[PDB]
Amino acid sequence: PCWYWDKKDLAHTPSQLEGLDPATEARYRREGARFIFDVGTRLGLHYDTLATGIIYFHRFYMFHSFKQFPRYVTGACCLFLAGKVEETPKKCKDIIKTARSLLNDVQFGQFGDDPKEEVMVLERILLQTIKFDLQVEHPYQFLLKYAKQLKGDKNKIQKLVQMAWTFVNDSLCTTLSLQWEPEIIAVAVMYLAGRLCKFEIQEWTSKPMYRRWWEQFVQDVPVDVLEDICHQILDLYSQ
Amino acid sequence: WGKRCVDKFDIIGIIGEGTYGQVYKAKDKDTGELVALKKVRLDNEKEGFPITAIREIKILRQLIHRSVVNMKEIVTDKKDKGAFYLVFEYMDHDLMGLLESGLVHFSEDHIKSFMKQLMEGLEYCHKKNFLHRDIKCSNILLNNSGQIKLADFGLARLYNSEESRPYTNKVITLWYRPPELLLGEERYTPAIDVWSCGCILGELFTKKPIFQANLELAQLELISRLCGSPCPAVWPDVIKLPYFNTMKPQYRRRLREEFSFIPSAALDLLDHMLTLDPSKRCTAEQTLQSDFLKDVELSKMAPPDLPHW
Protein backbone atom coordinates (compact mmCIF):
# COMPACT_ATOMS: atom_id res chain seq x y z
CA PRO A 1 0.00 0.00 0.00
CA CYS A 2 1.25 3.47 -0.96
CA TRP A 3 0.98 5.92 1.93
CA TYR A 4 2.27 9.09 0.29
CA TRP A 5 0.29 11.87 -1.41
CA ASP A 6 1.33 15.21 -2.94
CA LYS A 7 0.14 18.72 -1.94
CA LYS A 8 -2.36 18.76 -4.79
CA ASP A 9 -3.98 15.65 -3.28
CA LEU A 10 -3.72 17.12 0.22
CA ALA A 11 -5.71 20.09 -1.08
CA HIS A 12 -8.55 17.71 -1.95
CA THR A 13 -9.00 15.65 1.22
CA PRO A 14 -12.48 14.28 2.18
CA SER A 15 -12.62 17.05 4.80
CA GLN A 16 -12.07 19.90 2.34
CA LEU A 17 -14.45 18.20 -0.11
CA GLU A 18 -17.22 18.80 2.42
CA GLY A 19 -16.32 22.49 2.39
CA LEU A 20 -13.83 22.59 5.25
CA ASP A 21 -11.38 25.50 5.33
CA PRO A 22 -7.86 24.22 4.43
CA ALA A 23 -6.48 26.36 7.26
CA THR A 24 -8.97 24.81 9.69
CA GLU A 25 -8.03 21.23 8.76
CA ALA A 26 -4.40 22.17 9.34
CA ARG A 27 -5.47 23.38 12.78
CA TYR A 28 -7.49 20.21 13.41
CA ARG A 29 -4.49 18.04 12.57
CA ARG A 30 -2.30 20.10 14.89
CA GLU A 31 -4.76 19.75 17.77
CA GLY A 32 -5.25 16.05 17.08
CA ALA A 33 -1.57 15.15 16.78
CA ARG A 34 -0.62 17.20 19.84
CA PHE A 35 -3.49 15.50 21.67
CA ILE A 36 -2.10 12.02 21.02
CA PHE A 37 1.32 13.36 22.01
CA ASP A 38 -0.02 14.69 25.33
CA VAL A 39 -2.18 11.73 26.39
CA GLY A 40 0.58 9.25 25.61
CA THR A 41 3.19 11.32 27.42
CA ARG A 42 1.21 11.36 30.68
CA LEU A 43 0.97 7.58 30.34
CA GLY A 44 4.73 7.44 29.83
CA LEU A 45 4.78 5.96 26.33
CA HIS A 46 7.68 5.29 23.95
CA TYR A 47 8.32 8.12 21.46
CA ASP A 48 7.64 5.69 18.59
CA THR A 49 4.30 4.67 20.08
CA LEU A 50 3.27 8.33 19.98
CA ALA A 51 4.43 8.76 16.38
CA THR A 52 2.76 5.50 15.35
CA GLY A 53 -0.61 6.74 16.56
CA ILE A 54 -0.18 10.14 14.92
CA ILE A 55 0.60 8.52 11.56
CA TYR A 56 -2.55 6.42 11.99
CA PHE A 57 -4.36 9.69 12.73
CA HIS A 58 -3.04 11.51 9.66
CA ARG A 59 -3.72 8.54 7.37
CA PHE A 60 -7.23 8.13 8.76
CA TYR A 61 -8.29 11.60 7.63
CA MET A 62 -7.12 10.96 4.08
CA PHE A 63 -10.19 8.75 3.74
CA HIS A 64 -12.51 10.43 6.25
CA SER A 65 -13.79 13.93 6.99
CA PHE A 66 -13.33 15.83 10.27
CA LYS A 67 -16.98 16.87 9.96
CA GLN A 68 -18.05 13.24 10.25
CA PHE A 69 -15.49 11.98 12.76
CA PRO A 70 -14.48 13.94 15.90
CA ARG A 71 -10.70 14.31 16.05
CA TYR A 72 -10.07 13.73 19.76
CA VAL A 73 -12.08 10.51 19.72
CA THR A 74 -10.14 9.27 16.69
CA GLY A 75 -6.81 10.26 18.22
CA ALA A 76 -7.60 8.31 21.38
CA CYS A 77 -8.48 5.33 19.21
CA CYS A 78 -5.20 5.67 17.32
CA LEU A 79 -3.13 5.85 20.51
CA PHE A 80 -4.95 2.79 21.84
CA LEU A 81 -4.20 0.74 18.73
CA ALA A 82 -0.62 2.02 18.56
CA GLY A 83 0.02 0.82 22.11
CA LYS A 84 -0.81 -2.75 21.09
CA VAL A 85 1.13 -2.57 17.83
CA GLU A 86 4.28 -1.17 19.46
CA GLU A 87 3.64 -3.62 22.33
CA THR A 88 3.46 -0.94 25.01
CA PRO A 89 -0.26 -1.40 25.66
CA LYS A 90 -2.45 0.74 27.89
CA LYS A 91 -5.96 -0.03 29.11
CA CYS A 92 -8.60 1.84 27.10
CA LYS A 93 -10.17 2.95 30.38
CA ASP A 94 -6.97 4.70 31.44
CA ILE A 95 -6.64 6.54 28.13
CA ILE A 96 -10.05 8.15 28.64
CA LYS A 97 -9.12 9.17 32.19
CA THR A 98 -6.03 10.89 30.80
CA ALA A 99 -8.13 12.42 28.03
CA ARG A 100 -10.59 13.92 30.51
CA SER A 101 -7.75 15.54 32.46
CA LEU A 102 -6.27 17.20 29.37
CA LEU A 103 -9.46 18.15 27.51
CA ASN A 104 -11.98 20.72 28.68
CA ASP A 105 -15.74 20.20 28.94
CA VAL A 106 -16.41 21.27 25.34
CA GLN A 107 -13.61 19.18 23.82
CA PHE A 108 -14.46 16.07 25.83
CA GLY A 109 -18.05 16.32 24.62
CA GLN A 110 -16.96 14.50 21.46
CA PHE A 111 -16.77 11.25 23.44
CA GLY A 112 -20.49 11.50 24.20
CA ASP A 113 -21.65 9.96 27.47
CA ASP A 114 -19.93 6.60 26.99
CA PRO A 115 -16.38 7.29 25.69
CA LYS A 116 -15.25 3.65 25.84
CA GLU A 117 -17.89 2.35 23.43
CA GLU A 118 -17.28 5.42 21.27
CA VAL A 119 -13.61 4.50 20.91
CA MET A 120 -14.04 0.71 20.65
CA VAL A 121 -16.51 0.95 17.76
CA LEU A 122 -14.19 3.27 15.85
CA GLU A 123 -11.32 0.77 16.06
CA ARG A 124 -13.03 -1.55 13.58
CA ILE A 125 -13.15 1.35 11.12
CA LEU A 126 -9.58 2.49 11.86
CA LEU A 127 -8.08 -0.93 11.09
CA GLN A 128 -9.97 -1.05 7.80
CA THR A 129 -8.88 2.48 6.86
CA ILE A 130 -5.18 1.77 7.45
CA LYS A 131 -5.61 -1.50 5.54
CA PHE A 132 -4.03 -3.44 8.43
CA ASP A 133 -0.65 -1.93 7.58
CA LEU A 134 0.28 -1.65 11.24
CA GLN A 135 4.06 -1.52 11.13
CA VAL A 136 5.51 1.97 10.63
CA GLU A 137 8.95 3.51 11.09
CA HIS A 138 9.72 7.06 12.18
CA PRO A 139 12.46 9.70 11.56
CA TYR A 140 13.77 9.16 15.11
CA GLN A 141 15.39 5.85 14.14
CA PHE A 142 17.22 7.37 11.18
CA LEU A 143 18.00 10.60 13.03
CA LEU A 144 20.20 8.75 15.52
CA LYS A 145 21.53 6.36 12.89
CA TYR A 146 22.73 9.16 10.61
CA ALA A 147 24.10 11.30 13.46
CA LYS A 148 26.18 8.36 14.68
CA GLN A 149 28.24 8.63 11.49
CA LEU A 150 29.44 12.21 11.95
CA LYS A 151 33.07 12.86 12.86
CA GLY A 152 33.51 16.21 14.58
CA ASP A 153 32.94 18.25 17.74
CA LYS A 154 30.96 16.04 20.13
CA ASN A 155 29.26 19.07 21.69
CA LYS A 156 28.03 20.58 18.42
CA ILE A 157 26.87 17.27 16.95
CA GLN A 158 24.94 16.49 20.14
CA LYS A 159 23.15 19.83 19.89
CA LEU A 160 22.31 19.11 16.25
CA VAL A 161 20.52 15.92 17.31
CA GLN A 162 18.57 17.64 20.10
CA MET A 163 17.15 20.34 17.84
CA ALA A 164 16.50 17.83 15.06
CA TRP A 165 14.60 15.65 17.54
CA THR A 166 12.40 18.63 18.42
CA PHE A 167 11.71 19.31 14.74
CA VAL A 168 10.62 15.69 14.24
CA ASN A 169 8.09 16.11 17.05
CA ASP A 170 6.87 19.24 15.28
CA SER A 171 6.64 17.51 11.89
CA LEU A 172 4.14 15.07 13.40
CA CYS A 173 1.75 18.01 13.77
CA THR A 174 1.94 18.45 10.00
CA THR A 175 1.06 16.38 6.93
CA LEU A 176 4.76 15.76 6.27
CA SER A 177 4.44 12.09 7.25
CA LEU A 178 1.97 11.76 4.37
CA GLN A 179 4.41 13.48 2.01
CA TRP A 180 7.92 12.10 2.51
CA GLU A 181 9.57 8.94 3.81
CA PRO A 182 11.00 8.99 7.39
CA GLU A 183 14.56 8.86 6.02
CA ILE A 184 14.00 12.15 4.18
CA ILE A 185 12.37 13.83 7.18
CA ALA A 186 15.25 12.70 9.39
CA VAL A 187 17.63 14.40 6.96
CA ALA A 188 15.50 17.54 6.65
CA VAL A 189 15.47 18.19 10.40
CA MET A 190 19.25 17.78 10.39
CA TYR A 191 19.39 20.21 7.48
CA LEU A 192 17.22 22.72 9.35
CA ALA A 193 19.06 22.45 12.67
CA GLY A 194 22.36 22.66 10.82
CA ARG A 195 21.44 25.86 9.00
CA LEU A 196 20.17 27.43 12.23
CA CYS A 197 23.35 26.66 14.16
CA LYS A 198 25.58 27.48 11.17
CA PHE A 199 26.96 23.93 11.41
CA GLU A 200 28.74 22.69 8.30
CA ILE A 201 27.48 19.10 8.44
CA GLN A 202 29.57 18.22 5.38
CA GLU A 203 32.74 18.88 7.39
CA TRP A 204 31.64 16.06 9.69
CA THR A 205 31.31 13.56 6.85
CA SER A 206 33.80 11.39 4.96
CA LYS A 207 33.87 13.96 2.15
CA PRO A 208 34.09 17.49 3.65
CA MET A 209 34.65 18.95 0.17
CA TYR A 210 31.22 17.82 -1.04
CA ARG A 211 28.45 20.24 -0.05
CA ARG A 212 25.40 17.95 -0.19
CA TRP A 213 26.29 15.78 2.81
CA TRP A 214 22.86 14.13 2.86
CA GLU A 215 23.41 12.21 -0.38
CA GLN A 216 25.21 9.51 1.62
CA PHE A 217 22.02 8.82 3.58
CA VAL A 218 19.10 9.31 1.18
CA GLN A 219 19.15 8.88 -2.61
CA ASP A 220 17.91 11.41 -5.20
CA VAL A 221 16.74 14.26 -2.97
CA PRO A 222 17.12 17.81 -4.37
CA VAL A 223 17.86 20.70 -2.00
CA ASP A 224 14.41 22.01 -2.94
CA VAL A 225 12.79 19.12 -1.07
CA LEU A 226 14.75 19.71 2.13
CA GLU A 227 14.08 23.44 1.88
CA ASP A 228 10.35 22.80 1.42
CA ILE A 229 10.09 20.53 4.47
CA CYS A 230 11.80 23.23 6.53
CA HIS A 231 9.24 25.86 5.56
CA GLN A 232 6.32 23.61 6.52
CA ILE A 233 7.93 23.10 9.93
CA LEU A 234 8.86 26.77 10.38
CA ASP A 235 5.27 27.95 9.78
CA LEU A 236 4.16 26.07 12.88
CA TYR A 237 6.00 28.58 15.05
CA SER A 238 4.68 31.31 12.75
CA GLN A 239 1.57 32.49 14.60
CA TRP B 1 -3.52 -3.84 -1.35
CA GLY B 2 -6.61 -2.75 0.58
CA LYS B 3 -7.98 -5.31 3.02
CA ARG B 4 -11.63 -4.59 3.82
CA CYS B 5 -13.91 -6.72 1.63
CA VAL B 6 -17.26 -8.35 2.39
CA ASP B 7 -17.44 -12.13 2.76
CA LYS B 8 -17.65 -13.03 -0.92
CA PHE B 9 -16.47 -16.46 0.23
CA ASP B 10 -18.80 -19.46 0.14
CA ILE B 11 -18.30 -21.31 3.42
CA ILE B 12 -18.08 -25.10 3.20
CA GLY B 13 -17.67 -26.23 6.80
CA ILE B 14 -16.06 -25.57 10.17
CA ILE B 15 -12.51 -26.92 10.48
CA GLY B 16 -12.09 -26.54 14.24
CA GLU B 17 -11.71 -24.12 17.14
CA GLY B 18 -8.38 -22.33 16.74
CA THR B 19 -7.00 -19.35 18.66
CA TYR B 20 -9.49 -16.51 19.34
CA GLY B 21 -12.21 -17.90 17.07
CA GLN B 22 -13.46 -20.80 14.96
CA VAL B 23 -11.70 -21.58 11.68
CA TYR B 24 -13.92 -22.05 8.62
CA LYS B 25 -13.24 -23.78 5.30
CA ALA B 26 -14.34 -21.90 2.19
CA LYS B 27 -13.72 -21.01 -1.46
CA ASP B 28 -13.92 -17.47 -2.83
CA LYS B 29 -16.38 -16.85 -5.66
CA ASP B 30 -14.09 -14.88 -7.99
CA THR B 31 -10.72 -16.68 -8.02
CA GLY B 32 -11.69 -20.21 -7.07
CA GLU B 33 -9.72 -22.80 -5.08
CA LEU B 34 -9.95 -23.37 -1.32
CA VAL B 35 -9.24 -20.88 1.47
CA ALA B 36 -9.02 -21.09 5.27
CA LEU B 37 -10.76 -18.39 7.31
CA LYS B 38 -9.58 -17.65 10.85
CA LYS B 39 -12.41 -15.71 12.50
CA VAL B 40 -11.60 -12.83 14.84
CA ARG B 41 -14.49 -11.34 16.82
CA LEU B 42 -14.65 -7.92 18.47
CA ASP B 43 -18.01 -8.14 20.24
CA ASN B 44 -16.68 -10.65 22.76
CA GLU B 45 -13.84 -8.64 24.15
CA LYS B 46 -12.71 -5.47 25.88
CA GLU B 47 -9.37 -6.02 24.18
CA GLY B 48 -10.88 -4.23 21.24
CA PHE B 49 -8.90 -6.01 18.55
CA PRO B 50 -7.03 -8.90 20.24
CA ILE B 51 -3.33 -8.06 20.60
CA THR B 52 -2.31 -11.69 20.02
CA ALA B 53 -3.79 -11.45 16.53
CA ILE B 54 -1.97 -8.16 15.96
CA ARG B 55 1.50 -9.68 16.36
CA GLU B 56 0.55 -12.50 14.00
CA ILE B 57 -0.56 -10.03 11.33
CA LYS B 58 2.57 -7.90 11.79
CA ILE B 59 4.76 -10.96 11.21
CA LEU B 60 2.92 -12.70 8.35
CA ARG B 61 2.99 -9.56 6.16
CA GLN B 62 6.74 -9.68 6.38
CA LEU B 63 7.17 -13.44 5.84
CA ILE B 64 6.72 -14.37 2.17
CA HIS B 65 8.01 -17.90 1.55
CA ARG B 66 7.00 -20.99 -0.43
CA SER B 67 7.12 -23.16 2.70
CA VAL B 68 5.44 -20.71 5.07
CA VAL B 69 1.69 -20.18 5.48
CA ASN B 70 1.12 -16.72 4.01
CA MET B 71 -1.79 -14.46 4.93
CA LYS B 72 -3.61 -13.64 1.69
CA GLU B 73 -6.10 -11.02 2.87
CA ILE B 74 -8.30 -9.74 5.70
CA VAL B 75 -12.06 -9.50 5.14
CA THR B 76 -15.20 -8.43 7.05
CA ASP B 77 -18.99 -8.78 7.36
CA LYS B 78 -20.66 -5.36 7.19
CA LYS B 79 -21.83 1.21 15.60
CA ASP B 80 -21.95 -2.41 14.44
CA LYS B 81 -21.21 -5.81 15.97
CA GLY B 82 -19.11 -7.29 13.17
CA ALA B 83 -16.05 -9.53 12.95
CA PHE B 84 -12.85 -9.88 10.92
CA TYR B 85 -11.57 -12.91 9.02
CA LEU B 86 -7.94 -13.75 8.29
CA VAL B 87 -7.53 -15.38 4.88
CA PHE B 88 -4.99 -18.21 4.62
CA GLU B 89 -4.08 -20.60 1.82
CA TYR B 90 -5.91 -23.86 2.52
CA MET B 91 -3.93 -26.99 3.38
CA ASP B 92 -5.61 -30.38 3.44
CA HIS B 93 -3.61 -32.25 6.09
CA ASP B 94 -1.19 -31.84 8.98
CA LEU B 95 1.71 -34.11 9.98
CA MET B 96 0.24 -35.01 13.37
CA GLY B 97 -3.08 -36.30 12.04
CA LEU B 98 -1.45 -38.31 9.27
CA LEU B 99 0.74 -40.02 11.87
CA GLU B 100 -2.13 -40.50 14.33
CA SER B 101 -3.75 -42.89 11.87
CA GLY B 102 -1.83 -46.06 11.11
CA LEU B 103 -2.68 -45.55 7.45
CA VAL B 104 0.11 -43.22 6.32
CA HIS B 105 3.73 -44.35 6.37
CA PHE B 106 6.41 -42.18 4.79
CA SER B 107 9.28 -43.45 2.63
CA GLU B 108 12.85 -42.22 3.06
CA ASP B 109 12.40 -39.87 0.10
CA HIS B 110 9.15 -38.44 1.47
CA ILE B 111 10.85 -37.46 4.74
CA LYS B 112 13.75 -35.93 2.80
CA SER B 113 11.45 -33.71 0.74
CA PHE B 114 9.51 -32.85 3.89
CA MET B 115 12.42 -31.96 6.17
CA LYS B 116 13.86 -29.92 3.30
CA GLN B 117 10.78 -27.71 2.96
CA LEU B 118 10.51 -27.34 6.75
CA MET B 119 14.09 -26.20 7.35
CA GLU B 120 14.12 -24.02 4.24
CA GLY B 121 11.21 -22.19 5.85
CA LEU B 122 13.00 -21.85 9.18
CA GLU B 123 16.12 -20.41 7.55
CA TYR B 124 13.89 -17.75 6.02
CA CYS B 125 12.32 -17.03 9.41
CA HIS B 126 15.67 -17.03 11.21
CA LYS B 127 17.40 -14.79 8.65
CA LYS B 128 14.46 -12.41 9.10
CA ASN B 129 15.30 -12.60 12.82
CA PHE B 130 12.09 -14.39 13.84
CA LEU B 131 11.69 -17.17 16.39
CA HIS B 132 8.76 -19.50 15.74
CA ARG B 133 8.57 -20.53 19.40
CA ASP B 134 5.79 -23.08 18.80
CA ILE B 135 7.03 -25.68 16.31
CA LYS B 136 5.17 -28.99 16.52
CA CYS B 137 3.76 -31.78 14.35
CA SER B 138 0.28 -30.24 14.37
CA ASN B 139 1.55 -26.82 13.28
CA ILE B 140 3.05 -28.28 10.10
CA LEU B 141 0.60 -28.15 7.20
CA LEU B 142 0.89 -30.54 4.25
CA ASN B 143 -1.32 -30.69 1.15
CA ASN B 144 -1.94 -33.42 -1.43
CA SER B 145 0.61 -31.93 -3.83
CA GLY B 146 3.73 -32.53 -1.75
CA GLN B 147 3.92 -28.90 -0.63
CA ILE B 148 4.66 -28.20 3.05
CA LYS B 149 4.04 -25.00 5.01
CA LEU B 150 4.84 -23.94 8.57
CA ALA B 151 1.91 -22.42 10.47
CA ASP B 152 0.77 -20.85 13.75
CA PHE B 153 2.95 -17.76 14.18
CA GLY B 154 1.02 -16.52 17.20
CA LEU B 155 3.83 -17.15 19.69
CA ALA B 156 6.44 -15.87 17.24
CA ARG B 157 8.73 -13.00 18.23
CA LEU B 158 11.60 -10.87 16.91
CA TYR B 159 15.19 -11.87 17.65
CA ASN B 160 18.38 -9.84 18.07
CA SER B 161 21.87 -11.30 17.69
CA GLU B 162 23.15 -8.56 20.01
CA GLU B 163 21.90 -10.75 22.87
CA SER B 164 19.98 -7.77 24.24
CA ARG B 165 16.72 -9.70 24.50
CA PRO B 166 15.32 -11.84 27.37
CA TYR B 167 12.14 -13.62 26.22
CA THR B 168 9.46 -15.94 27.60
CA ASN B 169 10.31 -19.28 29.24
CA LYS B 170 7.11 -21.30 28.71
CA VAL B 171 7.55 -21.96 24.98
CA ILE B 172 7.16 -24.74 22.34
CA THR B 173 4.98 -26.75 24.80
CA LEU B 174 6.37 -29.61 26.88
CA TRP B 175 6.82 -32.48 24.41
CA TYR B 176 9.01 -30.64 21.90
CA ARG B 177 10.64 -28.19 24.33
CA PRO B 178 14.47 -27.85 24.24
CA PRO B 179 16.64 -28.67 27.29
CA GLU B 180 17.62 -25.02 27.81
CA LEU B 181 14.02 -23.89 28.35
CA LEU B 182 13.37 -26.76 30.76
CA LEU B 183 16.25 -25.45 32.88
CA GLY B 184 15.09 -21.84 32.86
CA GLU B 185 16.72 -20.11 29.90
CA GLU B 186 15.15 -16.79 28.88
CA ARG B 187 17.76 -15.22 26.59
CA TYR B 188 17.85 -17.97 23.97
CA THR B 189 18.58 -18.38 20.27
CA PRO B 190 16.76 -19.70 17.16
CA ALA B 191 18.29 -23.07 18.15
CA ILE B 192 15.10 -23.81 20.09
CA ASP B 193 13.25 -24.18 16.79
CA VAL B 194 15.90 -26.57 15.50
CA TRP B 195 15.44 -28.85 18.53
CA SER B 196 11.71 -29.00 17.82
CA CYS B 197 12.36 -29.98 14.21
CA GLY B 198 14.74 -32.62 15.55
CA CYS B 199 11.91 -33.97 17.68
CA ILE B 200 9.80 -34.02 14.52
CA LEU B 201 12.49 -35.67 12.39
CA GLY B 202 12.68 -38.55 14.86
CA GLU B 203 8.89 -38.62 15.13
CA LEU B 204 8.54 -39.27 11.39
CA PHE B 205 10.71 -42.39 11.63
CA THR B 206 8.95 -43.62 14.77
CA LYS B 207 5.36 -42.53 13.97
CA LYS B 208 4.97 -41.45 17.61
CA PRO B 209 6.63 -38.54 19.49
CA ILE B 210 9.99 -39.38 21.06
CA PHE B 211 9.51 -37.44 24.31
CA GLN B 212 6.13 -37.83 26.01
CA ALA B 213 5.80 -36.65 29.62
CA ASN B 214 3.26 -34.86 31.81
CA LEU B 215 5.68 -33.08 34.13
CA GLU B 216 8.53 -30.77 33.12
CA LEU B 217 10.97 -32.59 35.41
CA ALA B 218 9.91 -35.88 33.84
CA GLN B 219 10.39 -34.42 30.36
CA LEU B 220 14.00 -33.54 31.15
CA GLU B 221 14.62 -37.11 32.31
CA LEU B 222 13.30 -38.57 29.04
CA ILE B 223 15.64 -36.31 27.07
CA SER B 224 18.52 -37.20 29.38
CA ARG B 225 17.94 -40.96 29.05
CA LEU B 226 18.45 -40.72 25.28
CA CYS B 227 20.58 -37.61 24.70
CA GLY B 228 22.68 -37.92 27.85
CA SER B 229 22.57 -36.04 31.14
CA PRO B 230 23.46 -32.31 31.04
CA CYS B 231 27.14 -32.58 31.93
CA PRO B 232 29.50 -29.59 31.85
CA ALA B 233 31.79 -31.62 29.58
CA VAL B 234 29.01 -31.90 27.00
CA TRP B 235 27.51 -28.53 27.88
CA PRO B 236 29.81 -26.01 29.63
CA ASP B 237 27.22 -23.25 30.06
CA VAL B 238 24.64 -25.55 31.67
CA ILE B 239 25.79 -24.39 35.11
CA LYS B 240 24.58 -20.86 34.39
CA LEU B 241 20.98 -22.10 34.32
CA PRO B 242 18.67 -21.53 37.34
CA TYR B 243 17.21 -25.04 37.47
CA PHE B 244 20.39 -27.02 36.80
CA ASN B 245 21.23 -28.32 40.28
CA THR B 246 17.53 -28.69 41.13
CA MET B 247 16.57 -30.83 38.13
CA LYS B 248 19.42 -33.34 38.00
CA PRO B 249 18.06 -36.66 36.63
CA GLN B 250 24.09 -39.45 34.86
CA TYR B 251 23.09 -40.94 31.50
CA ARG B 252 25.15 -41.95 28.47
CA ARG B 253 24.04 -40.60 25.08
CA ARG B 254 22.43 -43.67 23.51
CA LEU B 255 20.77 -41.76 20.66
CA ARG B 256 22.39 -43.61 17.75
CA GLU B 257 21.71 -46.91 19.52
CA GLU B 258 17.95 -46.40 19.87
CA PHE B 259 17.59 -45.14 16.29
CA SER B 260 19.57 -47.87 14.52
CA PHE B 261 16.82 -48.48 11.95
CA ILE B 262 17.20 -44.89 10.77
CA PRO B 263 19.55 -44.56 7.73
CA SER B 264 23.15 -43.51 8.44
CA ALA B 265 22.78 -40.20 6.58
CA ALA B 266 19.52 -39.47 8.38
CA LEU B 267 20.88 -40.33 11.82
CA ASP B 268 23.77 -37.90 11.39
CA LEU B 269 21.24 -35.06 11.17
CA LEU B 270 19.10 -36.35 14.04
CA ASP B 271 22.20 -36.57 16.22
CA HIS B 272 23.31 -33.01 15.49
CA MET B 273 19.82 -31.53 15.82
CA LEU B 274 19.33 -33.11 19.24
CA THR B 275 22.49 -31.86 20.94
CA LEU B 276 22.04 -30.43 24.44
CA ASP B 277 24.26 -27.35 24.10
CA PRO B 278 22.43 -24.70 22.01
CA SER B 279 25.73 -23.11 20.98
CA LYS B 280 26.97 -26.54 19.92
CA ARG B 281 23.81 -27.33 17.96
CA CYS B 282 23.11 -27.38 14.21
CA THR B 283 21.44 -24.27 12.79
CA ALA B 284 18.79 -24.00 10.08
CA GLU B 285 21.29 -23.16 7.34
CA GLN B 286 23.53 -26.05 8.40
CA THR B 287 20.77 -28.68 8.36
CA LEU B 288 19.94 -27.91 4.73
CA GLN B 289 23.49 -28.90 3.81
CA SER B 290 23.75 -32.22 5.64
CA ASP B 291 23.93 -35.55 3.80
CA PHE B 292 20.22 -36.23 4.32
CA LEU B 293 19.04 -33.01 2.61
CA LYS B 294 21.79 -31.44 0.52
CA ASP B 295 21.07 -33.24 -2.74
CA VAL B 296 17.28 -33.36 -2.30
CA GLU B 297 16.02 -31.81 -5.54
CA LEU B 298 12.44 -30.81 -4.73
CA SER B 299 11.24 -30.57 -8.34
CA LYS B 300 12.34 -34.17 -8.93
CA MET B 301 10.26 -35.49 -6.03
CA ALA B 302 6.94 -37.27 -6.55
CA PRO B 303 3.91 -36.29 -4.40
CA PRO B 304 2.96 -38.60 -1.48
CA ASP B 305 0.02 -41.00 -1.29
CA LEU B 306 -2.18 -38.86 0.96
CA PRO B 307 -5.86 -39.90 1.00
CA HIS B 308 -8.74 -37.42 1.29
CA TRP B 309 -10.84 -38.00 4.40
Residue numbers in the entry:
A (entry chain A): 22 to 260
B (entry chain C): 719 to 796, 804 to 974, 977 to 1036
Sentences reproduced from the published study:
Human CDK12 (CrkRS) and its close homologue CDK13 (CDC2L5) are unusually large CDK family members (1,490 and 1,512 amino acids, respectively) containing a central kinase domain with flanking arginine-serine-rich (RS) domains. Recent work indicates that these CDKs regulate transcription via assembly with the 65 kDa cyclin K1 subunit (herein CycK). Ser2 phosphorylation is required for transcriptional elongation and is performed by both CDK12/CycK and CDK9/CycT (P-TEFb; the positive transcription elongation factor b), which are identified as orthologues of S. cerevisiae Ctk1/Ctk2 and Bur1/Bur2, respectively. Here, we report further structures of CDK12/CycK complexes solved in the presence of AMP-PNP and containing variable truncations of the C-terminal kinase extension.
Mass spectrometry revealed that many of the expressed CDK12 proteins were mono-phosphorylated, whereas the shorter construct CDK12715–1038 was essentially unphosphorylated. However, CDK12715–1038 was phosphorylated in vitro upon incubation with recombinant CAK from Candida albicans. Crystals obtained using the non-phosphorylated CDK12715–1038 protein exhibited multiple lattices and could not be indexed. However, diffraction quality crystals in the monoclinic space group P21 were obtained when the same complex was phosphorylated with CAK. In the more truncated structure, the electron density was most complete for the complex comprising chains A and C. CycK (chain A) was modelled between residues Pro22-Gln260 and the bound CDK12 subunit (chain C) between residues Trp719-Pro1031, with the exception of two regions of poor electron density between Gln797-Lys803 and Lys975-Lys976, respectively. Similarly, there is very poor or no electron density for AMP-PNP in the structure of the shorter CDK12715–1038 construct, further highlighting the importance of the αK extension. By contrast, the complex comprising CDK12715–1052 exhibited a 10-fold reduction in activity, while the activity of the CDK12715–1038 truncation was severely diminished.
